[PDB]
């Protein structure tokens, strides 16, 4: 499964 | 930026029994930026072919496999032509069936 990410730089 | 040039190998899936069906493989890798142009050549002509998905190595240099079914004869030539910014010309490599 993929990772649920709110990766905002 | 920091740019690495594309390294290309062109090879038969199975060793080249002359005549029989095989698979022609262009493996290009170790390049950055990702934007790259890759076509397999039938004596000098673009063969339709599939291309793998954009994946990369841990040093972030990308790799791709463009490959289509082919059947080796004795007298026609196959080759990969690749295009990419680090290269002044399109680099082109023909297929030595001993490699």
């Amino acid at each position: 499964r993929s990772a649920v990410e709110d990766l905002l730089f | 930026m920091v740019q690495h040039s594309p390294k290309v190998q062109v090879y038969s899936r199975h060793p080249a029994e002359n005549g029989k069906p095989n698979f022609l493989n262009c493996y290009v890798s170790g390049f950055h930026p990702p934007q790259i142009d890759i076509t397999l050549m039938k004596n000098g002509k673009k063969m339709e072919a599939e291309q793998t998905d954009l994946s990369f190595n841990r040093d972030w240099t990308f790799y791709l496999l463009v490959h289509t079914e082919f059947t080796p004869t004795v007298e026609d030539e196959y080759s990969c032509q690749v295009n990419h910014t680090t290269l002044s010309e399109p680099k082109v490599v023909k297929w030595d069936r001993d490699m």
């Binding site: 499964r1 993929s2 990772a3 649920v4 990410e5 709110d6 990766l7 905002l8 730089f9 | 930026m1 920091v2 740019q3 690495h4 390294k7 190998q9 090879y11 899936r13 698979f23 493989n25 493996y27 890798s29 170790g30 950055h32 930026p33 990702p34 934007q35 793998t52 998905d53 954009l54 994946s55 990369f56 841990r58 972030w60 240099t61 990308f62 496999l65 490959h67 001993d98 490699m99």
Partner: protein, 274 residues
């Protein structure tokens, strides 16, 4: 043995014409099983190994609503970075992300990963404690502070210690017989004269999986891998790999040389002499 589940995002700003392309890609060990692409027609996460297909339709729905969300963030990210550096919109730039987890033979979690690169250089990365980050430069230091305040490492850590490990088990289950089976290499040595006093002695290993292999030469005993040609290990197209390793040698001398292959799927090392 040990195994890894890793995902590879690539975000590609094409400056002139069109929003950036977002290509994620999924691997269990050396075996791709998943792919997404942002400029498709109604783009969707798709299978790319057979064994994953008997997984809930729940799954692929949730995975596209994820892949899409990431494409959004990484388009803003690609812009966010460009302005951090004050780079011209004239330029094409790329962000890459890699995360994943290595698991040990019992299930011991060996390593977790989450690394970002901008234009192929390291940007920020999650440390081995899974709790701090390394910022390569000053632009990265703003991303770091942002992520420390948002607690990003803590949600990464839980993904890597939980979902990743748990789902790598599910994957290796679906694909036993595929994933947990090592294919011995087909080994041959060929010989190609060049001069009348020098030949090339290629040593091939074909059709092996996983790509982990080592080929080495030996002149009467003495390891002669020194300026033997080793080529990068390539895919065969059927999910197995190849690699060869030639030495140049004078005529009549072939009878003294020697090649050796070791690979997981081999019981004891293969040894090749002309």
């Amino acid at each position: 043995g040990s195994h890894s589940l890793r995902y590879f995002h690539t975000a590609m700003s094409r400056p002139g014409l069109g929003e950036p392309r977002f290509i994620s890609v999924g691997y269990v060990d050396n075996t791709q099983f998943v792919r997404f692409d942002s400029d498709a027609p109604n783009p969707k996460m798709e299978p790319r190994a057979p064994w994953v297909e008997q997984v809930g339709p729940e799954y692929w729905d949730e995975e596209t609503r994820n892949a899409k969300d990431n494409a959004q963030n990484f388009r803003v990210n690609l812009q966010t970075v460009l302005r951090y550096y004050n780079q011209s919109e004239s330029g094409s730039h790329s962000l890459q992300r890699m995360y994943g987890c290595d698991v040990g033979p019992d299930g011991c979690l060996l390593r977790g990963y989450s690394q970002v690169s901008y234009d192929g250089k390291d940007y920020i990365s999650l440390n081995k404690d899974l709790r701090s980050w390394t910022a390569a430069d000053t632009a990265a230091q703003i991303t770091r502070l942002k992520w420390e305040e948002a607690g990003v490492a803590e949600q990464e850590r839980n993904y890597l210690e939980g979902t990743c490990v748990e789902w790598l088990a599910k994957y290796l289950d679906m694909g036993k017989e595929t994933l947990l089976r090592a294919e011995s290499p087909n080994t041959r040595m060929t010989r190609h004269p060049i001069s009348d006093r020098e030949v090339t002695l290629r040593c091939w290993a074909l059709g092996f999986y996983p790509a982990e292999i080592t080929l080495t030469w030996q002149r009467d005993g003495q390891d002669h891998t020194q300026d033997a040609e080793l080529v990068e290990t390539r895919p065969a197209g059927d999910g197995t790999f190849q690699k060869w390793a030639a030495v140049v040698v004078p005529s009549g001398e072939e009878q003294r040389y020697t090649c050796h292959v070791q690979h997981e799927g081999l019981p004891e090392p293969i040894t090749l002499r002309w």
